A paper describes a structure:
The disease arises in mice and humans from the misfolding of the acute phase protein serum amyloid A1 (SAA1). To investigate the molecular basis of the systemic AA amyloidosis, we here use electron cryo-microscopy (cryo-EM) and determined the structures of AA amyloid fibrils from a patient and from a diseased mouse. The human fibril encloses a clearly discernible cavity that contains many charged and polar amino acid residues, making it likely that the vacant space in the cavity is filled with water. Both fibril proteins adopt all-beta folds and differ sharply from the known globular conformations of SAA family members. The murine and the human fibril possess in-register, parallel cross-β sheets and adopt highly similar β-arch conformations at the protein N-termini.
Corresponding to previous observations, mass spectrometry (MS) shows that the mouse fibril proteins are N-terminal fragments of murine mSAA1.1 protein with mSAA1.1(1–76), mSAA1.1(1–82), and mSAA1.1(1–83) being particularly abundant. The ordered part of the density of the mouse fibril corresponds to residues 1–69 of mSAA1.1, the ordered part of the human fibril to hSAA1.1 residues 2–55. The dominant morphology of the mouse shows a width of 11.8 ± 0.5 nm and a cross-over distance of 75.7 ± 1.3 nm. Platinum side shadowing and TEM demonstrate the left-hand twist of the mouse fibril and its underlying cross-β sheets. The fold of the murine protein is compact and shows a high degree of complementarity. In the murine fibril they wrap around the N-terminal β-arch such that the resulting protein fold superficially resembles the Greek key topology, similar to α-synuclein fibrils. Another substantial difference between the human and the murine fibril protein concerns the packing interface between the two protein stacks. This interface is extremely small in the murine fibril. Two residues (Asp59 and Arg61) make bidentate, reciprocal salt bridges with the respective residues in the opposing protein stack. Each human fibril protein interacts with ten other protein molecules. The non-planarity of the murine fibril protein originates from the tilt of the protein stacks with respect to the fibril axis and a GPGG motif (residues 47–50) that induces a ~5.5 Å height change of the polypeptide chain relative to the fibril axis.
Author numbering:
A (entry chain I), B (entry chain K), C (entry chain G), D (entry chain E), E (entry chain C), F (entry chain A), ...: 1 to 69
Write the structure that this text describes.
């Protein structure tokens, strides 16, 4: 079992990035979730970059290189 | 079992990025979710970049290279 | 069992980054979650960078290199 | 069982970064969570950097290098 | 069982960075959590840096190097 | 059982960095938690640095090096 | 510089399997060489087998297999 | 510089399997070499087998296998 | 400089398996060499087997296997 | 400088398996060498086996295996 | 400088297995060498076995295994 | 400087297994060497076994194993 959450440069209001594994006889309730935004400037901004999602990376030679100038 | 969530440069209101695995006799309730936006400037912005989603990457030689100038 | 949460440069209001594993005969309640933003400047900002999510990285030779200039 | 939470450069209001493992006959309640922001300047800001999430890293030779100039 | 919480450069209001393991016949209640911010300057700021989350790192030779200039 | 909490450069209001292990027939209540901030300058600030979270690091030769200039 | 001599199942009389490299201002003399054979039985005999002479063998997968029954 | 001599199952009389490298201002003399054989039985005999002569063998997976039955 | 001599199951009379390196202002003499054989039985005999002569063998996985039945 | 001599199951008469390195202003003489054999039985006999001659063997995993039945 | 001589199961008469290094202004003489054999039985016999001659063996995992049954 | 001589299960007559290093202004004489054998039984016999000649053996894990049954 592999669980990997990556969260970056965001504005949230609730109930995020959750992992529920292997429950038995459970029960739950969540409530209302409000996002209210007025007059903001430069919210939720991210620079460059690549996103790799792999399971096995075998024998990688001179690979996975990112250059920023 | 492989679970990989990547979230970046966003504005949300609720109930995101969840992984529910291997439940038995469960039960749940979620509520209303409101997004209200007025008069914003430059929200949810992302720069360049590539997105790789693989399962196996074998013997990668001089590969997976991104250059930014 | 592998659980890895990485959270970075964000504004939240509640109920984030949770991992519930291996529960039996449980029960829970969560409440309302409000995000209210007015007149902000430069909220939730992130610089460059790459995101790798792998399970096995075997024999990586001269790999996984990021240069910033 | 592996649990790794990394949280960085954020503004929160409640109920974050929790790990609940191996409970039996439990029960719990959480309350309302409010985020109220007005007139701020430069909140939740992060510099550059890469995020690696792996389970096994075997025989890594001259790898995992980040340069900042 | 491995539990590692790292928290850095943040502003919180409550109920963070908790690990509940191996409970039986429990029960608990938490209260309301308010974040109120006005007129701040340079809150929740982080410099550069990389984030590695692994379980096993075997035979790493000349690896895991970060240079800052 | 391994439990490691590292907290650094933050402003909190309550109920943080807790580890509850191996309880039987327990019960508890927590109260309201308020964060109120006005007119501050340079709160919750962190310099550079990398974050490694591993379980086993075997045979690391000339590794895990960070240089600051 | 690569020099590989393999000699097998033979009858010789002299001056075999020599490698002279990188000489300067040299000089040499060899003598007479006589092979005299009478009435022999089953001299210089070899069983089956393949002869590979390569310089580079890269990425050979399930190759170079000889079966004898 | 690589020099590899393998000699097997032979009858010789003289001056075999020599490697002369990197000589300056030398000089030498060798004599007569006689092989005289009469009435022998089963001289210089070799069983099965393969002969590989390579310089580089890279990444050989499930290769170079000889079976004798 | 690499020098490897392997000699096996032989009958010789003289001046074998020599390596002369890095000589300056030398001089030498060798004499006569006689092999005389009469009426022998089963001289210079070798069983099965493979002969590998390589310089570099890199990353050999489940390779170089010989089975005798 | 590497010098490896392996000699096995042989009948010799003289001047074998020698390594002369790094001589200056030398001089030498060797004499006659006689091999005389009559009426022998089962001389110079070797069983099975493989001969590997390499310079570098890197990262050999489950390799170089010989089975005798 | 590496010098390794291995000699096994042989019949010799003289001047074997010698290593002369780093001589200056030398001089030497050797004499006659006679091998005389009559009527012998089972001389110079060797059982099974492999011969490895390497210079570097790095990171050998579950390798170099010989089984005799 | 490394010098390793291993000699096993042999019949010799003279001048074997010598190492002469680092001589200056020397001089020597050796005499005749006779091997005379008649009517012997089971001379110079060796059982099974492998011969490894390496210079560096680094990080050998579960390697170099010989089983005799």
């Amino acid at each position: 079992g592999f669980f990997s959450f990556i969260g970056e440069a965001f504005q949230g209001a609730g109930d995020m990035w959750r992992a529920y594994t292997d429950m038995k006889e459970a029960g739950w309730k969540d409530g209302d979730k409000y996002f209210h935004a007025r007059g903001n400037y430069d919210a939720a901004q991210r620079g460059p970059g690549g996103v790799w999602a792999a399971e096995k990376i075998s024998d990688a030679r001179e690979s996975f290189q990112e250059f920023f100038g």
